[PDB]
Design a protein around this nucleic acid. Structure first.
Lengths: 49, 42, 17, 126, 226, 192, 61, 113, 50, 101, 57
RNA sequence: CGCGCGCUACACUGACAGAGCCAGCGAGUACUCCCUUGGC
């Protein structure tokens, strides 16, 4: 992926998918950015496709 | 038992927005979850 | 209803007297 | 040494500081004139304890005022309570105790909140 | 006194603006109406004679024709042409309709009925050439739309007889008047007890609301020189 | 003087409402309302943020023009701006003085005394009223009629309340408040 | 059509009143002995002046 | 507590600290408590819907007393002041100091004047 | 008074959209169908992956 | 047709050729706050004047035959005189302490 | 109400002569005195009834 | 397609222009609105 905006603990991600259909396949899932941060894909984002 | 366990299901509190006469349960969430579970399994 | 109760009770008693 | 008293003033989140020292009658809020400081329609409300005291009480002093925090109603209220509590404390420390009791009796007799930080509290009906 | 300079042109006879409560004027509310919907046409005795005969509850109530002809009387009466008439409708679901002066209702009952169903759902009817609101559905109680100084009257049968001319001269100078009429076919006169000043009777015979308001408005047009 | 503009210097003597109008020689016509018209304690501007609403009957003990202005700010976008509301009061008293050659408080107390109703019905049974509900229904009618004539008006709400109040003092039928209060009285007599 | 000044002497205990209206005890301002009970809606306390039209009738529940 | 039942009617509350003084109104309706909450608490009890009311003080409370003409209530605060408040219009009809008016001292074991 | 004409539809129903220009009428129809369709497929995928 | 300010010195009154008259207040700059108006003459009002004694009443000659008296409170003229026959176009009050009305 | 007061007072007279529930009758008598005293001292016809019930009591 | 929970539009509660005047949460070597014509 690539991070778009970064609040403290949650975060948006930019250039990874195209469609929130694909994300709604990818719900609740596991995501491990390089450094060592385990984390959870929660939910699709609305306006940027 | 149907009437007195009414949180088996979901109902609008308003009634109809317009009253038409021409001649209440609008759904069953538990049954939908059940049958969707069955299909998704099978 | 108790005040008007004893009130019209008194009234009927007056009629009987 | 020099005639000086210093007195606060309280609201929700307005708060005001005022310094009463000897003078000939100048009055400024933050350094600007009193007739300049308010939303100008509440200027009468600020003028109030002056109009109960009579200016000759204010004739011998000079007050700087600080205000900060909060909106307009808040600010003007802080200015008036600082005015009142400051002039009472100045009379307390520097003229007759009977005159302090005079201003306190008169001003309180008018309006209660001109001397007490009665805080907006949180006690609804329980 | 001056001779009150003549009118070298004719006058337009503006209707009454909605914010004016000053003047004497005449309003009528067609209360106790029966305009129900079926599917999408209103519920009548035309074809629904059979379905209300099957379900066995007062086919003689499904009578929007009464309303149609009575509003025809009211809209076509010259008090509306000069602009001294104003109409509300009230129905047993509790619904209020403002009927304005500056409208023609189709004389055709079926176009009228479809107009009424469209009114009952959209809750407004706009003009074609003009953007103004013509038929507009509004809310209870009618007291909010009724001016204060009026004689809040209804017509009945067992009430005594006064003359309508006598009553319209009895009326106050600034004081407008509305009339509450129960436009049902058959039924008791309890429909406006919560609003009525006094029930009157105009004639010895039993009457329709149309001839009621018609004779009434003609007498008021006499007493107000129309 | 220290810093007091020339006009305040002029009215250094006694308390004037808006520093323009005195409370001194103002009679109370209604001996009933002699309590619930608070005219004893002077106020320099009714923008006095005090808690006259907690316990029983303290909308009474606060002075009346505060009640007026609080009632005036009773509708949607008119829910915050108490300063705008006292601005209406200042403007309108300027109006009614230039319209009446009189004291505006005298006009106001005459208006509320004259427009207090005495009896009305409940869901219909006709009964008598209480003095607080009198003054409240009075000031409410004044405010609502003012806004009703100022609804889509070109005349502003300030002049509308001004005209409503002077008509209320005059007692003629030209006021909505009088028309309504008389309707309440006549329907009270009607049911009886 | 005269008008009667009156005053509340005492508010009453257990009328069983429908709605916020209250039955109250009033004594006249003129004929101060003549004291009856009548009907008053709205908030009311003891000992305060009122103004009425119809005095002869006694108010019921 | 209630003298016939003897069991606990009710805890009241609204006090930043212990209640130093207690007084009742002779009519039977109104309570006052006074406490180092910097509060004078008028307790509206024997209507149905109970309430409190604060008289905020610039100081702390040591004692409260009443007028038999039950409109008036007075407070002794430890800075010395005494205060009479109108009890309905819960507002200060008057206040006065008492420091020098009781300043009688030099108790032994004190190195003060 | 110049009386006015009640603008309305003869065969009225709550369930047909009424637009003079057929182009924007069908455009609104296709838009609404695409919207409810996308919600439906989102529903399907979410329940599946859960 | 005639602007006239009350001798107090803050309010003007004037009459147009439509027969209406306006009355409105002004401070000491650009203030134009409309107080009241009247359109009852139905005919050009030529002259109007405040009373030099009362703060409330005025006169107005309208061009028809009518001369009339008004008080600022109501919405009706207090009095009305006729008698003239052709265009009446001037008029005023009577100065004097004894010259009351 | 005071229209009902004379009927009540006459019944108090009946109980006074036909003595039954003495403290009840006395208490209710005193109570109606204290809620209506000025009307009582102002009235005329009650004076005879009060004299009679007074003798009886 | 149905539904409520929010959000937005709806005209005197006007606009536009100038002038004048007051806050609380706020600090991880950390936060960016895209995607593209040309040229270096």
């Amino acid at each position: 992926g690539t991070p778009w905006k970064i609040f403290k603990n949650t975060a948006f991600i930019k250039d990874m998918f195209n469609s929130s259909l694909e994300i709604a396949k990818f719900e609740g899932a596991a995501i491990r950015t390089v450094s060592g941060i385990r984390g959870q894909i929660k939910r699709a984002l609305s306006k940027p496709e | 038992r149907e009437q007195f366990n009414p949180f088996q299901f979901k109902t609008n509190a308003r009634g109809p927005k317009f009253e038409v006469t021409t001649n209440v349960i609008k759904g069953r969430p538990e049954l939908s979850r059940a049958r969707s579970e069955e299909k998704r399994r099978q | 209803m108790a005040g008007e109760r004893i009130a019209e009770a008194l009234e009927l008693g007056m009629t009987d007297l | 040494s020099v005639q000086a008293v210093q007195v606060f003033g309280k609201k929700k989140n307005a708060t005001a500081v005022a310094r009463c020292v000897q003078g000939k009658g100048l009055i400024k809020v933050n350094g600007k004139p009193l007739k300049l400081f308010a939303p100008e329609i509440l200027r009468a409300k600020l003028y109030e304890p002056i109009l109960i005291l009579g200016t000759d009480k204010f004739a011998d002093v000079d007050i700087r005022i600080r205000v900060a925090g909060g909106g307009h109603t808040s600010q003007v209220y802080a200015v008036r309570q600082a005015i009142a509590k400051s002039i009472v404390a100045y009379y307390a420390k520097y003229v007759d105790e009977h005159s302090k009791n005079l201003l306190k009796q008169e001003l309180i007799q008018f309006d209660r909140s001109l001397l007490v930080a009665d805080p907006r509290r949180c006690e609804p009906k329980k | 006194p001056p001779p009150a300079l003549p009118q070298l042109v004719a006058e337009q006879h503006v209707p009454i603006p909605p914010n004016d409560k000053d003047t004497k004027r005449l309003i009528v509310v067609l209360s106790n109406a029966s305009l129900e919907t079926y599917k999408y046409t209103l519920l009548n005795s035309d074809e629904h004679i059979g379905i209300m005969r099957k379900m066995n509850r007062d086919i003689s109530d499904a009578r929007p024709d009464i309303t149609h002809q009575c509003l025809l009387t009211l809209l076509d009466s010259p008090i509306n042409k000069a602009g001294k008439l104003q109409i509300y409708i009230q129905t047993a679901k509790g619904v209020l309709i403002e009927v304005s002066p500056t409208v023609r209702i189709p004389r055709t009952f079926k176009r009228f009925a479809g107009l009424m169903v469209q009114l009952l759902h959209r809750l407004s009817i706009k003009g074609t050439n003009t953007n103004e609101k013509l038929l507009k559905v509004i809310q209870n109680p009618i007291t909010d739309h009724l001016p204060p100084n009026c004689r809040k009257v209804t017509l009945s049968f067992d009430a005594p007889l006064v003359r309508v001319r006598d009553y319209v001269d009895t009326l106050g100078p600034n004081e407008s008047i509305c009339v509450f009429v129960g436009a049902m076919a058959k039924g008791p006169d309890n429909f406006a007890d919560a609003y009525v000043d006094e029930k009157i009777s105009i004639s010895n015979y039993s009457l329709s609301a149309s001839v009621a308001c018609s004779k009434f408005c003609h007498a008021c047009e006499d007493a107000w020189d129309i | 003087y220290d810093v007091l503009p020339k006009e305040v210097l002029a009215e250094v003597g006694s308390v004037k409402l808006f520093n323009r109008w005195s409370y001194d020689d103002i009679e109370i016509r209604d001996i009933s309302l002699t309590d619930y018209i608070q005219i004893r304690a002077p106020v320099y501007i009714p923008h006095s943020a005090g808690r006259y609403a907690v316990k029983r009957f303290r909308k009474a003990n606060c002075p009346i023009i505060e009640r007026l202005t609080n009632s005036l700010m009773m509708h949607g976008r008119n829910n915050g701006k108490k300063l705008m509301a006292v601005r209406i009061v200042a403007h309108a008293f300027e109006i009614i003085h230039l319209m009446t050659d009189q004291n505006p408080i005298q006009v106001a107390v005459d208006a509320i005394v004259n427009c207090g109703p005495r009896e009305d019905s409940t869901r219909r049974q006709a009964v008598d009223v209480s003095p607080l509900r009198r003054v409240n229904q009075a000031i409410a009618l004044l405010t609502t009629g003012a806004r009703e004539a100022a609804f889509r008006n070109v005349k502003t709400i300030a002049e509308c309340l001004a005209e409503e109040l002077i008509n209320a003092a005059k007692g003629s039928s030209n006021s909505y408040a009088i028309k309504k209060k008389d309707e309440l009285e006549r329907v009270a007599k009607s049911n009886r | 059509a005269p008008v009667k000044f009156v005053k509340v002497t005492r508010v009453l205990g257990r009328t069983g009143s429908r709605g916020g209206v209250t039955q109250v005890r009033v004594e006249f301002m003129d004929d101060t002995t003549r004291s009856i009970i009548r009907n008053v809606k709205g908030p009311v306390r003891e000992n305060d002046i009122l103004v009425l039209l119809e005095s002869e009738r006694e108010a019921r529940r | 507590w209630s003298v016939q039942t003897g069991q606990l009617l009710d805890r009241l509350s609204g006090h930043e600290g212990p209640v130093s003084s207690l007084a009742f109104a002779p009519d039977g309706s109104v309570l006052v408590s006074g406490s180092w909450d910097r509060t004078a608490r008028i307790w509206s009890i024997f209507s149905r819907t109970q309430t409190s009311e604060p008289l905020q003080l610039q100081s702390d409370v040591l004692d409260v007393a009443f007028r038999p003409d039950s409109k008036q209530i007075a407070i002794s605060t430890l800075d010395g002041q005494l205060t009479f408040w109108s009890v309905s219009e819960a507002q200060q009809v008057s206040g006065v100091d008492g420091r020098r008016d009781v300043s009688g001292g030099r108790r032994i074991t004190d190195r003060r004047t | 008074i110049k009386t006015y004409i009640p603008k309305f539809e003869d065969d009225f129903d709550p369930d047909k959209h009424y637009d003079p220009n057929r182009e924007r009428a069908e455009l609104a129809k296709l838009k609404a169908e695409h919207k409810r369709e996308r919600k439906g497929a989102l529903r399907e995928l979410r329940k599946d992956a859960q | 047709h005639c602007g006239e300010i009350r001798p107090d010195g803050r309010v003007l009154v004037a009459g147009e050729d439509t027969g209406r008259m306006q009355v409105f207040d002004v401070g000491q700059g650009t203030r134009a706050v409309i107080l009241k108006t009247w359109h009852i003459h139905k005919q050009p009002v030529w002259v109007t004047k405040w009373s030099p004694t009362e703060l409330t009443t005025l006169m107005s000659c309208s061009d028809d035959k009518t001369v009339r008296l008004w008080d600022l409170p109501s919405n009706d003229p207090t009095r009305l005189f006729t008698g003239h026959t052709d265009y009446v176009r001037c008029g005023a009050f009577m100065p004097g302490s004894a010259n009351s009305n | 109400p005071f229209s009902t007061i004379p009927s009540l007072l006459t019944f108090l007279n009946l109980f006074a002569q036909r003595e039954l529930n003495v403290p009840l009758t006395c208490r209710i008598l005193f109570f109606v005195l204290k809620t209506h005293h000025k009307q009582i001292v102002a009235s005329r016809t009650m004076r005879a009834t009060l004299e009679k019930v007074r003798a009886n009591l």
